[PDB]
Amino acid sequence: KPLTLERTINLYPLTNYTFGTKEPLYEKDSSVAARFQRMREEFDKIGMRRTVEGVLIVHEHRLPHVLLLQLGTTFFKLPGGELNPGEDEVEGLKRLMTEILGRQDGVLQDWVIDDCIGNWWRPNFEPPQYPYIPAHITKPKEHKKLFLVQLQEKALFAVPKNYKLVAAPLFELYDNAPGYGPIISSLPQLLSRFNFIYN
Amino acid sequence: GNKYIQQTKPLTLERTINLYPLTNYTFGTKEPLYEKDSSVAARFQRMREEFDKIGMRRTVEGVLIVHEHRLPHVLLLQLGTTFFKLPGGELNPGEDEVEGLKRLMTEILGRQDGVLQDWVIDDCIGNWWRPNFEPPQYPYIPAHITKPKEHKKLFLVQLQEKALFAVPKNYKLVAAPLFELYDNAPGYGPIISSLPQLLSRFNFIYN
RNA sequence: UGUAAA
């Protein structure tokens, strides 16, 4: 069978991974309004924002869990961020993953990113995003591309102090846009096609 | 010699798919295809009996996509006013999923022409599991469910540039824009309404 | 899912 028809992915116990911390790494925007202001500034000058995010998966008791960065108590995001202009998507994601999650011991982590799982577009300088370019939207302000990041068997991660890292089970995310937004809450669907091996 | 350049990105990273105007396709009518069950009560009754003699039900469904003015539409079957379903149905025990789907596709939409109807089915887009003898299905196997009652598999069916389809007289055919499925999720159920999310990874060529 | 710990 083609990898196109069946895609097999190895998951490892959450306990295969040890998590340390590093110095805080704050977002470039300090508020929602600031975020859209900078989105506006840069659109004018570089064009559509290109964002990439990684979906790292571990299992617990043969159950897939997605790793999420928690900010405060009520906000969660996938590890990722903004591509520099002209930057390659996967190369850019590896860069961003190391920045946010890379161990500190000089041992450089090797990210395996071979799978695109989805795409979301932001038509305006506003919160709504859609898994398709909406009708007659010729100039989307942001394009967000999600990848499956296959974790090695064991790894060491370093979480900037300002974040917590959590492993959310799929049932927690499914049907829970009010808690995770439409992008994170539909990862269970986006991941369903994959043939997961537990270990 | 000459190097014939193919797509650089792996197929796992970039899946390119040709879509064609809905106007490229011819639609006709054929003999009605009645559902094997007469009522919800009958449905889960027959499902219970079969689980005992055949094991877990295995369903396959196909997602056929066309475009109108460069917006993707999924082809849906509508029964009466109240029910949308993807073309597909039940595998026989042991039947290959993809061969089964082609069988079912041909049966529900196949042209009664005498012309070869060939389906291109190279992509799995998702899996849904029914943990009890009840309607609810999940895009994952829930905790503590070792014996799901049904496994449903979704496939992307690539259409040729032109094709003829015959629709069973008792069904209507609908091309549903992705924004409809997404903006009005309640109307299509959890499987069809999350098709825009499941299709988003594809690089659709418009023609 | 948003800045109250962030």
Swiss-Prot record, chain B:
UniProt site positions, description: Interaction with RNA: 35, 43
Motif Nudix box per UniProt: ranges: 89-110
Ranges for domain Nudix hydrolase: 56-181
UniProt keyword Phosphoprotein present: yes
Primary location: nucleus
PTM per Swiss-Prot/TrEMBL: Acetylated mainly by p300/CBP, recruited to the complex by CPSF6. Acetylation decreases interaction with PAPAO. Deacetylated by the class I/II HDACs, HDAC1, HDAC3 and HDAC10, and by the class III HDACs, SIRT1 and SIRT2.
N6-acetyllysine modifications at: 3, 9, 36
Single GO MF annotation: RNA binding
UniProt region (Necessary for RNA-binding), positions on chain: 1-127
Record text on subunit structure and interactions: Homodimer (via N- and C-terminus); binds RNA as homodimer. Component of the cleavage factor Im (CFIm) complex which is a heterotetramer composed of two subunits of NUDT21/CPSF5 and two subunits of CPSF6 or CPSF7 or a heterodimer of CPSF6 and CPSF7. The cleavage factor Im (CFIm) complex associates with the CPSF and CSTF complexes to promote the assembly of the core mRNA 3'-processing machinery. Interacts with CPSF6 (via the RRM domain); this interaction is direct and enhances binding to RNA. Interacts with CPSF7. Interacts with FIP1L1; this interaction occurs in a RNA sequence-specific manner.
Protein name: Cleavage and polyadenylation specificity factor subunit 5
Organism: Homo sapiens
